[PDB]
Design a protein around this ligand. Structure first.
Ligand code: HEM
Lengths: 97, 39, 46, 416, 122, 122
């Protein structure tokens, strides 16, 4: 069998991405799920890069966020992503519902 | 692979195009162009 | 908003890249779907 | 040996003293490729009507090929000359024979044949593949016509077909066996009397990558076929195309040698018994060809696996074919050519086909010399030109739910 | 989900009474024409929710010709939705061809299921 | 994993020479006695790594009686390891019964595989 089916890991990846027998008449709405998954990555990805700089102490939380925005190299980008990407995560989730 | 190297071509092309258009659209506003007046 | 200038320059670069890439994706999808949107069926029972 | 008689008709004969039986036949080109949708199958009907005439002890049979038609009168060696006269008569009175004919019975016979080619899964698959590959042109039409078009043919249609195509410039008398060529030529000259006319212009045809799926879930297997634009009889790659086809050769799962056949695809598909059988072929028409394989898969869940592996093995054609595979393919193609040219009936059919469609027939020794000149680099160049990344035409009959749509198979043609 | 037994019960409850019949039936045809499924080649019974054991049995007990015609109509509907185009008026399914072909089989399936349920609680 | 063909090549390379034979063979018997597999009912060829296409083919081509005997010996070994007990010396597999029953089939499978590999690279 092809490597994309013999190997269990690639077999799973195939069953879900490469050979998943999707119906032929699905609109673009059925893509929202993927976006949601994409957003779940982004929320996590940017998220993991904010905790590397976010300090959870109450006297430091807001100052730490401002340190991210002002001092970290791309910190403004990471915060704006992690926030507007949550807003878009919920846009896509409401569209998926 | 050649994907890694080729990505540099497009990244550099767009980066230089934008970093040459931006300092032309905004040349009257950037610092490096205004600093002369206040020196 | 000290990142304003850098933020908008990065945004311009991102829009250029993503808009070109989105047009390319549109073209590729329409092209690879031409076989499906051009399917023609027949049903000829006795 | 060739002799152009009066009327300009050419008698071509390949006489061999070792021939078991003799054969002589008149072929007048213009098979299904010369027809059109409304009058499709008229060539086959006309040839059947002519071949149904009194045989005077010989064996009169119709040819009914895609691009040429003819009547062949097999007979033992000493009787050959008589058979000659017979066919000559049958063709000098072709219009009379057609006029005096009640086409009813011949039309049910032709309809039975057309149903046969639409029931035998391989015949159906290959006919559909040819139709879809050359769709829009006369070459797509069945050799024997469809059941819907056969019933709509009348005597005047056959008469018009004969008048257009049964002319000296478009007809050849082919022969083989053990006999004196001059005797047969003289016997035919005194008896052959056919209308003058210019060789009809052979209709154009162009390959079009396409897919046709006649999924019948009631069948027990999946009969598929996949092919690319091959090499016509004119192309100098003709034998090179045959060598490329033989590199992958045949395979029957239940045959004893199934576990020992050289081709790599055979070893690949036996690991999980992906396919029941397959055969690679290079069908060659006058100017265009279909190079590919036919396959029957018993397990309906492994059609995709077979297509994937077969197209990967095709990809190997342009990169990694070894001198062992090329030498094996050369030897097997030479042996297959020599086998195809043993029976006098086959030799006569081959002579007619070549002389009508390319004008000159390469002797078997010349063909062997041309094949032995092939090196592995020539085969890989041909694979790059014609197989690597070229559009494919697909066909399938039953349990083809697992045959993934075009794009998958087409993209398999270029992945490394 | 509502059983075809109950749907037909309500439909015959309405159809028997002339006032409700006159008021609804024109509205029923108008609703079925505005539904827009006929423009895609689908008969009404093609729309039914197949993913139920009763309905699966009903299809599994269809004749050959009806089964193949249903397959072709469903495939045509999928293709039309895929290509974002509709059948012309002349090719669409006419009101008289929407013949409720699958309802009897579903009703038989529900009759069998209801008898089994009733007897299990005898 | 070492192909059984190579193991037999080495074994005959040693056995052919009288000095190496006289030295090793006593140590060979002593090592197979100390191995401890015989006290659990297993012959040597039961220990072989089954999870290989060559070995799997060799097992698939065993005679019926040898196949059933192997199955029972493996089952007995599993039970003994499960109950943490060993067979008494009178019931343990004696050196004479450790007869190398599976090696011929393994060698045939190896020969077939090596011929196929050699011809594939002709
Ligand atoms: C679906 C999953 C998630 C959603 C929808 C989400 C959404 C959000 C939103 C809306 C905020 C508000 C931030 C602001 O308004 O500035 C936030 C804050 C934050 N999130 Fe996430 N988040 C997700 C997962 C994660 C993960 C996996 C991490 C891992 C570190 C993370 C780390 C953070 C941090 C550190 C903040 C603090 C905000 C800041 O310092 O600017 N989030 N999240």
């Amino acid at each position: 069998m092809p490597t994309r089916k013999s190997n269990t890991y690639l077999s799973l990846v195939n069953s879900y991405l490469i050979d998943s027998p999707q119906p032929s008449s699905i609109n673009y709405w059925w893509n929202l799920g993927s976006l949601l998954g994409l957003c779940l990555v982004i929320q996590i990805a940017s998220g993991v890069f904010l905790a590397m700089h976010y300090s959870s102490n109450i006297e430091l939380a807001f100052d730490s966020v401002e340190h991210i925005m002002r001092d970290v190299n791309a910190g403004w980008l990471i915060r704006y992503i992690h926030a507007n990407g949550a807003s878009f995560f919920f846009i896509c989730m409401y569209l998926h519902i | 692979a050649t994907i890694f190297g080729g990505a540099f071509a497009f990244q550099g092309f767009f980066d230089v195009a934008v970093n040459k258009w931006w300092e032309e659209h905004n040349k009257a506003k950037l610092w490096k162009n205004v600093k002369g007046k206040f020196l | 908003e000290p990142e304003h200038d850098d933020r908008k320059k990065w945004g311009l670069k991102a829009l250029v890249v993503l808009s070109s890439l989105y047009l390319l994706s549109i073209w590729v999808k329409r092209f690879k779907w031409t076989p499906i949107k051009n399917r023609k069926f027949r049903f000829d029972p006795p | 040996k060739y002799t152009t008689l009066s009327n300009g008709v050419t008698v071509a004969t390949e006489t061999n003293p070792a021939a078991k039986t003799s054969s002589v036949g008149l072929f007048f080109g213009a098979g299904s490729r010369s027809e059109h949708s409304h009058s499709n199958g008229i060539s086959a009907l006309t040839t059947n009507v002519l071949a149904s005439q009194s045989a005077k002890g010989s064996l009169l049979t119709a040819k009914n090929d895609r691009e040429f038609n003819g009547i062949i009168a097999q007979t033992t060696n000493d009787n050959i000359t008589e058979a000659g006269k017979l066919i000559a008569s049958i063709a000098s009175n072709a219009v009379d024979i057609v006029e005096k004919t009640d086409l009813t019975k011949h039309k049910q016979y032709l309809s039975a044949q057309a149903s046969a080619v639409e029931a035998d899964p391989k015949s159906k698959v290959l006919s559909h593949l040819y139709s879809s590959a050359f769709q829009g042109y006369s070459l797509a039409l069945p050799t024997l016509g469809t059941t819907e078009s056969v019933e709509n043919l009348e005597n005047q249609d056959s008469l018009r077909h004969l008048a257009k195509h049964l002319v000296n410039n478009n007809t050849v008398i082919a022969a083989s066996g053990n006999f004196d060529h001059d005797k047969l030529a003289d016997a035919i000259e005194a008896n052959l009397k056919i209308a003058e006319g210019v060789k009809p212009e052979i209709k154009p045809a162009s390959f079009l990558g396409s897919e046709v799926r006649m999924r019948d879930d009631t069948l027990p297997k999946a009969y598929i076929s996949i092919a690319v634009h091959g090499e016509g009889l004119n192309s100098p790659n003709y034998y090179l195309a045959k060598v490329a086809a033989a590199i992958y050769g045949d395979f029957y799962l239940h045959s004893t040698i199934a576990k020992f056949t050289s081709p790599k695809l055979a070893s690949i598909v036996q690991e999980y018994n992906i396919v029941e059988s397959y055969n690679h072929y290079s069908k060659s028409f006058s100017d265009t060809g279909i190079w590919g394989y036919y396959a029957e898969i018993a397990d309906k869940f492994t059609v995709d696996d077979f297509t994937h592996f077969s197209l990967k093995e095709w990809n190997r054609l342009s990169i990694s074919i070894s001198e062992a595979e090329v030498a094996r393919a050369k030897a097997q193609v030479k042996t297959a050519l020599a086998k195809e040219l043993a029976n006098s009936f086959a030799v006569t059919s081959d002579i007619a086909e070549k002389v009508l469609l390319v004008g000159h027939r390469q002797s078997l020794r010349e063909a062997f010399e041309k094949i032995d000149a092939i090196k592995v680099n020539d085969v890989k160049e041909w694979g790059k030109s014609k197989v690597w990344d070229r559009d494919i035409v697909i066909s399938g009959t039953g349990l083809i739910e697992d045959l993934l749509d075009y794009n998958r198979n087409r993209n398999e043609m270029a992945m490394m | 989900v509502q059983s075809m037994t109950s749907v037909v019960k309500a439909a015959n409850f309405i159809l028997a009474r002339p006032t409700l019949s006159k008021i609804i039936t024109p509205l029923a045809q108008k609703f079925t024409a505005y539904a827009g499924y006929r423009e895609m080649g689908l008969k009404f019974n093609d729309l039914l929710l197949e993913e139920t054991p009763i309905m699966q049995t009903a299809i599994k007990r269809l004749p050959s010709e009806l089964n193949y015609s249903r397959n072709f109509r469903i495939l045509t509907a999928h293709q039309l939705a895929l290509s974002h185009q509709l059948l012309p008026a002349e090719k669409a399914v006419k009101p008289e061809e929407d013949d409720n072909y699958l309802i009897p089989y579903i009703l038989e399936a529900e009759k069998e299921a209801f008898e089994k349920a009733e007897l299990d609680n005898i």
